[PDB]
Amino acid sequence: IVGGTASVRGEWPWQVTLHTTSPTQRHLCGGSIIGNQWILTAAHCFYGVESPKILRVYSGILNQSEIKEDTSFFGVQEIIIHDQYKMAESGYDIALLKLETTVNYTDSQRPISLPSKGDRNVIYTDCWVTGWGYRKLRDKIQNTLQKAKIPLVTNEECQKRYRGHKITHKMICAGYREGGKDACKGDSGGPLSCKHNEVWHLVGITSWGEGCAQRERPGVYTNVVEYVDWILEKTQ
């Protein structure tokens, strides 16, 4: 996260850190708890992941340094990538992780709601991006989960900033015209979380952008409301 600040324990309890263990253990992507056995993340995360065997899902983590050899994690039973996914910039950047067992929800590990049926024309004005990613283009993965408030951009404006890409209704963009706050390397797969009527909704999945927090180059997120039917089909 560029231009963000440290979170405190329990502040984003749907946020998980997805680790790979091949050839060594490290943070790979963010993700969001959406059900007791379900994580929503980005399809692009699994480029070069040979199978679910090497994945570990950690919940309730504030600092990456908390994770040691006896820290409990969830195994991944299945990776479900959208059938039309080809590359992040061309959309369909969405994946479900089915966990091997059910998360018991606690103060540190909680689900986030999907965008609600009948909220298609809500204007979300309280949106946040969170993650352990770089604070700038050439940086490092952060120990403490970071947060930043970022405004949504219309798809019309976003397309004008990305005339070499097809910005579709299945994407949502977010960023300041002057730049300075954005996701960056290591944040992808995590949530764009928006609060409406004091309930948090998983509005976006951190996906791609040109650079990090550059002027007039918003971050691009998978528009989760356009995939609710797909999510419900796979999770039922």
Ligand SMILES: [O-][n+]1cc(-c2c(-n3cnnn3)ccc(Cl)c2F)ccc1[C@@H](CC1CC1)n1cc(-c2c(F)cncc2Cl)cn1
């Ligand atoms: O995370 N992430 C974020 C953006 C992004 C950008 N960026 C544009 N240029 N950089 N970021 C801008 C806006 C938005 Cl919304 C974005 F989602 C683009 C790509 C990525 C991911 C893909 C990769 C998982 C498949 N990634 C993670 C690392 C990485 C690393 F480098 C060092 N150690 C550990 C890690 Cl996991 C590198 N890439």
